[PDB]
């Protein structure tokens, strides 16, 4: 099947995701509605269930509302069984309508539907060429007070109906009992409770096994992607090991996490997570910047391009960035009382920009509302005639049809305070996008250059956002034109490719034996060669091969990041997909603890070792800075690390700070890791 197929679970840049808060979209089945204090019939309390469900989503697929927009993926609230108790917070009755307060990850939230309903949703979506992404929140269960078992449901965790444990009498040690985080440090936010949510202890193998089993259940039903909740609040090492187990199993899928960033914020740990965890991220840098430029109008198009350029520089897999202009955790993009062009332009940019675009339900209806839960009102209308609906309808399909949009580089062609003209390019395909955010002033555009072949190009939007046609000369030079006030236009060229071009490889990380999906153009119909670094993969190493997609088995090559490339049956070489992370083997999560490691203020302890997963003795790749406040206390340090299973590791600790790097003396520490699951190794610092 082709790169654009709904069957393609691991790569999503040809898609447009529509993010649905299930309870707030459509009530398709009144018979599963919660009742009494848990339900708001008059919708006056935005913290109770309103009744939205899976049948409702199914209905809006079948009746053409969603398909008419050209969305090709649905991202839905966590589907698992949540607590059913009503909690009074700050004078207001609250429910689990949002899906984040799980109690049994192996059963459904009955308010949304049963497993038959869920299968119908998967099957209906797939029959319409729509992928399904679920929220998954393995950080915690639900609200709990260790000292008051009667509060809520005491964070109780069930396994297909049978009790594993609750928070107050945590016999099996399933949870952390370290208080609640104050969000002051990353460590603090990982090993203490997020708000009052009973925090899962993933270093307990019972929990590693449980969550692997649970996710396998949902993936086995046909789920195409996973949006991880609160990734900043779980150990990086556990998450890396977790996704590796997905990639090495029967159901590799696209994964991405939420690591919130405010306006004007870049974060090195956020970048490391996206580059090294094996999991992708929502692109808050993009989102916040688009909001500043279009919604708040506090920064310029030059600032916008700067962020496109800096994100490109820092993230290894830029076609995996999940972009958006708002979501369940942000004020609604539409400002009440303001015009709609800001929304329409922000949508157009997102739909034509690199990555995987996501649109929050009701954006296309200009829904307003600041703060949670005002930003989660019931869908106001299913009017297919709005300008925003038509913008998405016109541009969403380009991600499937034009590989420059799906995979292409990004280049600034023209910029001033109010106007941005960018070009996407992939092989001979290109798209040129022009946006003028100024609603009162038109701008003459002169000396514009493009990679478009000669000829006249109509605006893909046909002037819906006051765009215009352009004429292109032999050298790609664009005849002078005026970009109207509020103007937005898209001009595009798609061509058959003869030379092979790789647009994406997914997943981006894997152990030998995993099957990866290589998407692009010009691979031809006859099986050729896949390369990992200089190592050729041929014959049975190639699972399947067609013009736009190749599936290949990761060869037993040296672990570490490497380039992936192809060569056609005729011997023509492709470009290289950079930074594919070859793992040593199946992973386990190991908690490393080192004792008696005293340091001066400003100096931290890091972990290094012989395996690629331990940085291959490179002090610049040393793992850390390690933690020393919660699980273990200074001068003990600890860190949870994904390492190859059933493998003898050689390792040492180092102290880095003040431009100095000091390694342990003595011989290496050694440790043979567990065959599966999780482990712990404790050693003492060697002077
Ligand atoms: Ca319902
Ligand atoms: Ca239909
Ligand atoms: Ca946690
Ligand atoms: Ca900014
Ligand atoms: Cl169906
Ligand atoms: Cl290219
Ligand atoms: Cl093409
Ligand atoms: Cl083959």
mmCIF file with all atom_site columns, N, CA and C and ligand atoms in Angstrom, residues 264 289 292 299, ligand 4:
data_model
loop_
_atom_site.group_PDB
_atom_site.id
_atom_site.type_symbol
_atom_site.label_atom_id
_atom_site.label_alt_id
_atom_site.label_comp_id
_atom_site.label_asym_id
_atom_site.label_entity_id
_atom_site.label_seq_id
_atom_site.pdbx_PDB_ins_code
_atom_site.Cartn_x
_atom_site.Cartn_y
_atom_site.Cartn_z
_atom_site.occupancy
_atom_site.B_iso_or_equiv
_atom_site.pdbx_formal_charge
_atom_site.auth_seq_id
_atom_site.auth_comp_id
_atom_site.auth_asym_id
_atom_site.auth_atom_id
_atom_site.pdbx_PDB_model_num
ATOM   1  N  N   . UNK A 1 264 ? 7.285 31.953 24.074 1.00 0.00 ? 264 UNK A N   1
ATOM   2  C  CA  . UNK A 1 264 ? 8.663 32.426 24.239 1.00 0.00 ? 264 UNK A CA  1
ATOM   3  C  C   . UNK A 1 264 ? 9.529 31.470 25.045 1.00 0.00 ? 264 UNK A C   1
ATOM   4  N  N   . UNK A 1 289 ? 3.886 30.391 19.022 1.00 0.00 ? 289 UNK A N   1
ATOM   5  C  CA  . UNK A 1 289 ? 4.342 31.467 18.148 1.00 0.00 ? 289 UNK A CA  1
ATOM   6  C  C   . UNK A 1 289 ? 3.256 31.901 17.173 1.00 0.00 ? 289 UNK A C   1
ATOM   7  N  N   . UNK A 1 292 ? 0.968 34.117 19.042 1.00 0.00 ? 292 UNK A N   1
ATOM   8  C  CA  . UNK A 1 292 ? 1.489 35.469 19.224 1.00 0.00 ? 292 UNK A CA  1
ATOM   9  C  C   . UNK A 1 292 ? 1.330 36.292 17.958 1.00 0.00 ? 292 UNK A C   1
ATOM   10 N  N   . UNK A 1 299 ? 3.893 39.711 17.867 1.00 0.00 ? 299 UNK A N   1
ATOM   11 C  CA  . UNK A 1 299 ? 5.165 39.449 17.202 1.00 0.00 ? 299 UNK A CA  1
ATOM   12 C  C   . UNK A 1 299 ? 4.931 39.420 15.709 1.00 0.00 ? 299 UNK A C   1
HETATM 13 CA CA1 . LIG B 2 .   ? 7.996 34.461 20.496 1.00 0.00 ? 4   LIG B CA1 1
#
